Amino acid sequence: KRIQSVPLVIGQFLEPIDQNTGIVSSTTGMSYVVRILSTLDRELLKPSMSVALHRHSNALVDILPPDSDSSISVMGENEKPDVTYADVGGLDMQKQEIREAVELPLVQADLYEQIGIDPPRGVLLYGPPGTGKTMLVKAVANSTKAAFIRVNGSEFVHKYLGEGPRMVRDVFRLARENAPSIIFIDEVDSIATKRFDAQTGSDREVQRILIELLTQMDGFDQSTNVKVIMATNRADTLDPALLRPGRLDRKIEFPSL
Amino acid sequence: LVRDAFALAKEKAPTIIFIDELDAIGTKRFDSEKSGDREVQRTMLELLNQLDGFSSDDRVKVLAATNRVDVLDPALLRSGRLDRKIEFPLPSEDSRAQILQIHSRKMTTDDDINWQELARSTDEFNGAQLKAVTVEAGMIALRNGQSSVKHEDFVEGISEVQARKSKSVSFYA
Amino acid sequence: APSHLWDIMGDRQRLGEEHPLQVARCTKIIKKYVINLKQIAKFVVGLGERVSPTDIEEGMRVGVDRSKYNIELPLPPRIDPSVTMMTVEEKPDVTYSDVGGCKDQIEKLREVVELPLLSPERFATLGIDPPKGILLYGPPGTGKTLCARAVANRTDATFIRVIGSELVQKYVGEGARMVRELFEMARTKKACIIFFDEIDAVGGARFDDGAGGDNEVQRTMLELITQLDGFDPRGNIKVMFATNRPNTLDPALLRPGRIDRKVEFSLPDLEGRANIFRIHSKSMSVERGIRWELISRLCPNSTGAELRSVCTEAGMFAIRARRKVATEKDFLKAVDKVISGYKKFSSTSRYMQYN
Amino acid sequence: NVKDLKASQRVCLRSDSYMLHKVLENKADPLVSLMMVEKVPDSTYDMVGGLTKQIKEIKEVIELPVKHPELFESLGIAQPKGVILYGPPGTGKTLLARAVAHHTDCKFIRVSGAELVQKYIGEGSRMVRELFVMAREHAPSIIFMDEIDSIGSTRVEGSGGGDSEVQRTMLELLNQLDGFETSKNIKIIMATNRLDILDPALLRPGRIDRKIEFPPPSVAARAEILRIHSRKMNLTRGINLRKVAEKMNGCSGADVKGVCTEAGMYALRERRIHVTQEDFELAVGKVMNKNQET
Amino acid sequence: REMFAYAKEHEPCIIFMDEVDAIGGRRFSEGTSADREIQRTLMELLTQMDGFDNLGQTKIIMATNRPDTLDPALLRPGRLDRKVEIP
Amino acid sequence: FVSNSEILKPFEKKQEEEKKQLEEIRGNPLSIGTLEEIIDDDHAIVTSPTMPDYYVSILSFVDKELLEPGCSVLLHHKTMSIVGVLQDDADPMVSVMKMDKSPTESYSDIGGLESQIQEIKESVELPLTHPELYEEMGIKPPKGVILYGAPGTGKTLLAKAVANQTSATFLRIVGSELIQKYLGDGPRLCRQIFKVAGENAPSIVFIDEIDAIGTKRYDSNSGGEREIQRTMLELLNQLDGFDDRGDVKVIMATNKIETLDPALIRPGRIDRKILFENPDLSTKKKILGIHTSKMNLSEDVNLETLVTTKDDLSGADIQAMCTEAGLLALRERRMQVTAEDFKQAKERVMKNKVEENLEGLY
């Protein structure tokens, strides 16, 4: 186990195949199928778990802890509780429905099981840009006092090609270890999902993000302990397929005029 | 391309930048539907920032040639970029007599043709339309087998299609 | 069978490392050569063993070794476009004698195109300039494209047929590169012929205030005019502009200096339409003693497209009308059929001269 | 050997000798950009109340010849191609098309308007007809387009760009499917509001032989909906089913479904497992305000 | 994001914008005409001047010809606070 | 024994000795790529899907005529040399080409139109089935026929029965697919339609029901007025600028051809024009017997009585009543359709399916 030592490569697990054998995908973009080290175990890892690999042979080394560094949120809140929720008035009608779909399921999860109502996993906020959102998410995150992840919608794309789909996965993996986690996406209307016709043939950047956004929602969150909040502008900037049941059923519009 | 054009223009000071058909790039880009913006003005912003930026000091100058002034960006005309706006209308009467004589220096004639007479037979013709008359005058002598271009070659060329003259049939009644 | 002979010489051309060269375009020439790869990587190199110092030019693809970069063999530039390779045809079926009529639409084209190519020293005595471009529009249905192929047969050189919709690509700005693809072969291949078809979809100013998506097409001509007559008068071959709508074109494109000879097709008269049936009389089946001048006289003025339809449909009456060959009676039935019967609507001829 | 290997099969490739090692898995069911393939949905006839009158019509037209192909063959007639319905907005017809593939063991496949025009070399126009061919590969299933329609959310309420183009195209492509096995059984179910939006060529016979009008839900129609669609959970039977239906004015199948979501939202504030008529009264007044707004 | 890296380092800094009609565009979906990186660049101004990053020590001076071409959401308060009229 | 030793023995010996060299050549991972251009010096340039740039020579197992820009070749791993050309198998790329598995729709079902049926057969099926008639005559065969008439006259089934007996390649294209959303892809599609169809067999290009570029009402795929001139004139150049030996036939049909640009027709290529009208009482008796041939009818149903009740009906309206009468008997599960089903069928067709035209005169 200690032959590997310092020169290690960061890998990612994909799917189990054979006993003590698994497929891995490193940050270099080249996927390899190697054998699992005897000191490791298939039950001690996760399908999305990141692992270590050798420099040349790229053999499996060790299972990293369920903490993904990546970028953006990294660890967690830093100096966030600078304000309270009383600084924004008139939204008490709108903020009441937000606390029920965000703060309520993160406290008592048996209220939805006994009553038998499926709490919305995703949250979209409509309305003209520059009215709501903004300080609202900060007020909810400060009153909850739990894990909070704010990832900008335009930051998912990286200069490297295959880094796009891996940065999206690392955001949801941070919500796996910490149950009271809130994932916020600022300006989700940039990449959106497929963005109507994205001309995928000429640009692959969308297909890598398109597959992950649909897979991460259905693949995770079954425990209903993690909620997703996205910040958009209007409905014409998003794919209406998101409103289909099974992924995101929630619709919130700003009370304009 | 334009950004590096002024970068190399700073190395050699006595340089002159020429732009052909300025109407190719310009617009305010409005009265449309959503996307389709900046399909033009991406390059125009280079001419805005560079000419008003560190460039255009002493010997750095840009001469922008275009077709018509009806369609362009009024923001392009400024005392910091294009100063002199000069109209170049059609040639005058006696001016066309000197133009026709210059294009004939490579031809062969008897020098018996009055050039002031051919200029008076031409009313408001383009400069290229003047040189095009000498082209047809040479083709007429080839069909008739003449060893030199005579007076009737330029006269028959006007009757043919050159400038504002088109006839597919005699049609006299 | 041919693979056995090539395996003998394949020892030096395979085992050894020669061909595995990385091709890239050279940028700066210091007489150190700065060359940028296809992966966007810049490096410095120099000449080779058999490489000549005068062969390397600015803006040329130069293959270099992948391990230790060095100049080995030069390559012709502009290797990216694959589109213009299929635009060149060979041996068109339409001959020079296929164009009927004694009128002036024949002799005027051969003197400004075929004459300087066959006898370049004829006009050199007078010291004149042969017309670079020509003008052929005419009404739809006169077989204008047939006259363009008749010139390529007598020329016996490279012919290029360009579709007006081919210049417009699926990206904005790619059409500008499509223009230089045509003029690059003019300097590479001398004494060739280029032909544009349906330029109305391209030309015209169309200004600004319209739908707003029209600014992409108007830049194709501004790229085409620049490549034709620019700051540097670079040109060799003849350029042919053709379309069915001369009125919708650019009023600058309709003025000389890019074009000198201007020929517009017209409908043949009683003497003209007679030769249309004479060139078709050698074909099909013509009964002895039939005068074709009476058939073209009963037919009104119409384009050559409807004139050739008389001889084609005349053979169709040999089945239903119970006839052996085409007789005079079947010709009179074609007058009320090929002409009078097919008028109705959707018949162009002279209908649309403008828009 | 090569007999056990076919296309779209993920295998292993050795790094040293560069040869075949083993077989990993096959290709996933979803393909291209967006692929919706669902077999045996959860929508049934007992889960949709009040439409039984319209269920018997689509059962003897769509469902009947699919399960018994020997009927129309003995009668000498041909199976109708398309079926389209129209009515007020907020239709519950989505569950009707899902219930057809349930009993017929077919699949439920939707075509997205963005799947028609994409970026490909030579396949750009194929993607319009690709999902028509892809639906033929696995099962007859159902061709159902709900994607492009005017409920008021999108502009140009008179027509659409990607609506009449794909709907009219797939009707004329059945000539190849006509006469070939497991093909002609494929039908097309459409949806719309007004008949003036469609082209006059669609109103002519030979393409859509049956046009069923969808009436708006009435008081008696919402009675069976309130006891099925409105209750997904454990509730009290003390409330009146016909009294709540009278309080809802102009509520379609979509507005009544929203009552189920808001039925317990007012109970979440007090955190109680008992849901009385106090919450249902506040749910009806909340839905009616969103309908009258704008 | 490379520009705002110096904002947190040197506090007395001001970002000049000279004749910029571009990055404040609109362009939602016509098919996007391959704007994929530009649409994110438009959103970059909707993040640094919006989210929890420290502000107030770095002033944004933006200059444009016609504000109607720019995104109306960018002109609203919360990003550009002061509109200076230069008649 | 003697003959096999001087023929099969020397040939099989050279084949076994040759394949021993194929291991060092056709072995290895065998990367592929796209051919760029060739040269008389036997060299080419190939770009793999990883987008490299390589310039190598031309090896065996390939011909100079087989090399074309835009094709697929086979490279080498170590030496990176072209092994040979790889032809595209499993159909010519796009499979929606309507290869016509031939359901065999005969002329007996379209019967009653025989006055206008023999019109298209002589200008389409006759030169394909009996080419010696036009070749020995000397006239050039027409490239197709244009169809015009009211909906329901059987213009769709007329061209379907022609391609059945010819046993050749035939295409069916919807007129609404000529225009796409992206600008410039409209004329690019029309180039690939006639290119692939002309390479394999004397095919026929049939585009039915052309609404292209009129009454737009299209928000998504509308390209303005520039898509109008590029897409339409691209089809005109395929019948003019595109050279062909006469094996490509183009037949266009729709409800109204007046909205289309008449310059696109160019009737020097198409010398045949077929119109359509409503059938009389004598023709409807033959059409009614076609649909009722396989249908089981009762003894109280008269064929001449149903035709007499028909007023201002087309060929599609006759089948509509035969289909509606079959659905009524299907609900009650009756083998022989009674007379009561035809009474309720004619009332539903004349009400909804049959709408009064806007002609209105008289």
XYZ file of C-alpha atoms in Angstrom, chain F residues 107-317:
211
model
C -52.585 0.211 -59.736
C -55.874 -1.552 -58.937
C -56.424 0.645 -55.871
C -55.889 3.910 -57.790
C -58.200 2.654 -60.525
C -60.737 4.991 -62.051
C -58.059 7.651 -62.619
C -56.645 5.693 -65.587
C -57.264 8.702 -67.845
C -54.550 10.576 -65.924
C -52.664 7.459 -64.783
C -51.272 6.628 -68.235
C -50.089 10.250 -68.462
C -47.419 9.936 -65.764
C -46.579 6.328 -66.697
C -45.233 7.341 -70.115
C -43.032 10.175 -68.807
C -41.686 8.294 -65.758
C -42.146 4.521 -65.819
C -41.789 4.128 -69.594
C -38.190 5.441 -69.939
C -37.136 3.418 -66.884
C -38.856 0.165 -67.884
C -38.416 0.493 -71.676
C -35.485 2.861 -72.323
C -35.183 1.667 -75.937
C -38.232 3.730 -76.945
C -36.713 7.121 -76.099
C -33.135 6.201 -77.049
C -34.067 4.980 -80.534
C -36.465 7.912 -80.983
C -33.787 10.544 -80.323
C -35.813 12.847 -78.062
C -34.669 13.534 -74.512
C -36.986 12.071 -71.855
C -38.595 14.535 -69.434
C -37.186 14.897 -65.933
C -40.597 14.623 -64.265
C -44.088 16.080 -64.018
C -45.769 18.712 -61.843
C -49.145 17.950 -60.261
C -51.886 20.415 -59.328
C -55.406 19.929 -58.030
C -57.710 19.997 -55.057
C -56.819 17.865 -52.015
C -58.234 14.354 -52.144
C -57.701 13.548 -55.836
C -55.141 10.839 -55.059
C -51.981 12.752 -55.965
C -50.100 10.939 -53.184
C -50.987 7.417 -54.357
C -50.372 8.252 -58.032
C -46.592 8.505 -57.635
C -46.519 5.612 -55.151
C -47.819 3.028 -57.633
C -45.301 4.140 -60.276
C -42.222 3.320 -58.179
C -43.606 -0.158 -57.432
C -43.284 -1.627 -60.931
C -40.033 0.196 -61.735
C -38.253 -1.590 -58.845
C -35.776 1.313 -58.688
C -34.789 3.904 -56.098
C -37.490 6.432 -55.216
C -37.575 9.225 -52.644
C -40.319 10.875 -50.587
C -39.482 14.281 -49.085
C -41.757 16.680 -47.214
C -41.644 20.221 -48.579
C -41.447 21.755 -45.099
C -37.967 20.294 -44.471
C -36.297 22.446 -47.147
C -35.814 25.278 -44.616
C -33.973 24.845 -41.313
C -33.384 27.104 -38.321
C -29.673 27.737 -38.889
C -28.819 30.233 -41.623
C -27.057 28.570 -44.552
C -28.082 24.967 -43.842
C -31.136 25.225 -46.106
C -29.307 25.088 -49.445
C -26.710 22.744 -47.928
C -29.426 20.126 -47.407
C -30.728 20.408 -50.980
C -27.205 19.670 -52.239
C -26.993 16.353 -50.369
C -30.472 15.228 -51.470
C -29.668 15.072 -55.190
C -26.026 14.076 -54.635
C -26.639 10.809 -52.779
C -29.728 9.865 -54.800
C -27.889 10.321 -58.104
C -24.981 8.048 -57.183
C -27.013 4.856 -56.607
C -29.462 3.691 -59.313
C -31.682 5.819 -61.591
C -33.423 7.300 -58.560
C -36.384 9.695 -58.468
C -36.696 12.779 -56.252
C -40.341 13.297 -55.247
C -41.169 16.153 -52.864
C -44.833 16.107 -51.849
C -46.996 18.922 -50.448
C -44.646 21.889 -50.719
C -45.691 24.772 -48.470
C -42.107 26.075 -48.404
C -41.833 29.859 -48.036
C -45.414 31.053 -47.806
C -47.821 32.056 -45.020
C -44.820 31.860 -42.688
C -46.142 32.276 -39.120
C -42.854 30.689 -37.998
C -41.129 32.091 -34.913
C -38.361 29.495 -34.528
C -36.915 28.498 -37.910
C -37.643 31.767 -39.740
C -34.495 32.992 -41.474
C -35.802 36.226 -42.985
C -35.790 37.022 -46.682
C -32.275 35.644 -47.244
C -33.325 32.021 -46.710
C -35.989 32.593 -49.382
C -33.572 33.194 -52.259
C -30.918 30.652 -51.239
C -33.150 27.630 -50.595
C -35.405 27.959 -53.649
C -32.728 28.814 -56.225
C -30.676 25.858 -54.965
C -33.352 23.482 -56.269
C -33.465 25.304 -59.615
C -29.714 24.857 -60.109
C -30.058 21.107 -59.512
C -32.247 20.950 -62.636
C -30.001 23.327 -64.610
C -26.419 23.617 -63.380
C -26.250 20.021 -62.146
C -25.332 17.669 -64.988
C -27.087 14.316 -65.299
C -27.430 11.573 -67.907
C -31.219 11.443 -67.510
C -31.475 8.919 -64.662
C -32.650 11.506 -62.092
C -36.366 12.340 -62.125
C -37.919 15.200 -60.141
C -41.679 15.183 -59.504
C -43.261 17.936 -57.399
C -46.853 17.986 -56.163
C -48.830 20.083 -53.683
C -52.256 21.622 -53.141
C -51.508 25.031 -54.697
C -48.496 25.655 -56.943
C -49.355 29.324 -57.557
C -47.766 30.519 -54.303
C -44.451 28.954 -55.339
C -41.961 30.842 -57.488
C -42.774 29.955 -61.128
C -39.115 30.479 -62.079
C -38.294 27.376 -60.019
C -40.263 25.164 -62.418
C -38.376 26.187 -65.592
C -40.639 24.135 -67.916
C -37.962 23.291 -70.424
C -36.969 20.468 -68.109
C -40.564 19.457 -67.316
C -42.690 19.139 -70.455
C -45.550 17.348 -68.655
C -48.278 19.046 -66.609
C -51.088 16.975 -65.082
C -54.165 18.537 -63.490
C -56.938 16.948 -61.432
C -60.684 17.466 -61.004
C -63.554 15.852 -59.126
C -64.745 12.463 -60.425
C -68.184 11.933 -61.917
C -70.861 9.400 -60.957
C -69.296 6.793 -63.264
C -65.799 7.070 -61.767
C -66.995 6.942 -58.148
C -68.639 3.576 -58.857
C -65.209 2.120 -59.657
C -63.511 3.777 -56.675
C -66.205 2.570 -54.266
C -65.773 -1.008 -55.484
C -62.047 -0.812 -54.736
C -62.379 -0.138 -51.007
C -65.316 -2.560 -50.687
C -63.406 -5.361 -52.445
C -61.823 -6.586 -49.201
C -64.687 -5.240 -47.070
C -67.613 -7.483 -46.135
C -70.906 -5.787 -47.020
C -74.441 -6.962 -46.311
C -77.064 -7.780 -48.940
C -79.095 -4.602 -48.310
C -76.186 -2.310 -49.287
C -76.190 -1.073 -52.889
C -73.070 0.277 -54.578
C -74.906 2.478 -57.088
C -77.089 3.959 -54.335
C -74.107 5.199 -52.312
C -72.549 6.770 -55.415
C -75.793 8.603 -56.216
C -75.785 10.170 -52.739
C -72.227 11.425 -53.320
C -72.214 15.147 -54.135
C -68.990 17.142 -54.613
C -66.590 14.539 -53.246
C -63.008 13.555 -54.027
C -61.205 10.223 -53.917
C -60.266 10.720 -50.268
C -63.878 11.412 -49.272
